[PDB]
Amino acid sequence: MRSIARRTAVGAALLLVMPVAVWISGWRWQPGEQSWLLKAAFWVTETVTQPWGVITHLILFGWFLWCLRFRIKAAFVLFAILAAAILVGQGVKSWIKDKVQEPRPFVIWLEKTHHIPVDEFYTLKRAERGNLVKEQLAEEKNIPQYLRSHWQKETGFAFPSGHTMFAASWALLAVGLLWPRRRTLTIAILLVWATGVMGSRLLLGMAWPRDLVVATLISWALVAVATWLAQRICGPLTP
């Protein structure tokens, strides 16, 4: 267990760099940003937002099980563990957002520009908030249609970062399960991919580094258990 906590903590440290840096800078999101960088950021984000959220979890689990090389009986358990891992992560994210009631960077701008209180905006039904955001943004035209539609779709609170929990958890599961087999390429790729998603969430005016630094911390604490259980129940990572 001691190892799982250190291993994943090293990977957590590497992901934490990006939001800690974006935090210290005191960077504040602005609209109609670098068009080429926003399309690139959004597509990175598209690897994690549903339905592609399930596809990625599956593709990743498929590659994970393939590396770990478990039996049919163990494979089943490895899926149940990882599925639970990513599902507890998103379940934590919700029973926090609703309690902290933090607004999103696009919402603060959209409601400040339409001189509508952000607190009264969040008083509304998530359905009618999406109805409002579709109608208010249609007046902007400066914002691209891919992002404009993604905004209506999302709405809701910002603290902590859901995408950066899915993505951070998978890069952390890579250090927690594929580092004893020493599969560096996967660990490195998944770290960069998760970091890009964390980057993408700031770039599209959706989250604060506060959400990312806390979301990485939760993903770590959850993965450090999930990978421990996976070792005890499924079997050793190493033969």
Ligand X SMILES: CC(C)=CCC/C(C)=C/CC/C(C)=C/COP(=O)(O)OP(=O)(O)O
Q: What is the dihedral of CA 147, 149, 154, 159, to 10 degrees?
A: 20
Give the residue with the Cβ less far from ligand X, 5 or 147: 147
Q: What is the DSSP letter of 207?
A: -
Instruction: For 17-73, give the secondary structure using H, E and C.
Output: HHHHHHHHHCCCCCCCCCHHHHHHHHHHHCCCCCCHHHHHHHHHHHHHHHHHCCCHH
Q: How far is the CB of 3 from ligand X (least distance, A)?
A: 26
* Closest distance to ligand X from the beta carbon of 184 (Å): 26
Which of 164, 231 has the CB closer to ligand X? 164
CA distance 180 to 25: 36
Nearer to ligand X by Cβ, of 62 and 117: the residue is 62
DSSP one-letter string for 119-171: HHHTTS-HHHHHHHHHHHHTTT-SS-HHHHHHHHHH-S--SS-SHHHHHHHHH
- The residues of the shown chain that bind ligand X, judged by CB under 6 A, are 49-50, 53-54, 57, 83, 86-87, 90, 154, 158, 161-164, 166, 201, 206-207, 211
CB of residue 236 to ligand X, shortest distance in Å: 25
Q: How far is the CB of 81 from ligand X (least distance, A)?
A: 11
Residue sitting closest to ligand X (CB): 162
Q: Please, which residue, 57 or 148, has the CB nearer to ligand X?
A: 57
**Pair 11, 171: CB distance under 8 Å:** yes
Least distance from ligand X to the Cβ atom of residue 198, Å: 9
In the complex with ligand X, the residue whose CB is nearer, 200 or 231, is 200
172 neighbors 219 (Cβ within 8 angstroms): yes
Shortest Å distance, C-beta 156 to ligand X: 6
Break-preceding residues in the chain (C–N over 2.5 Å): none
The half-sphere exposure of 20 on its side-chain side, counting CA atoms within 13 A, is 8
Q: Looking at beta carbons only, is 150 or 183 nearer to ligand X?
A: 150
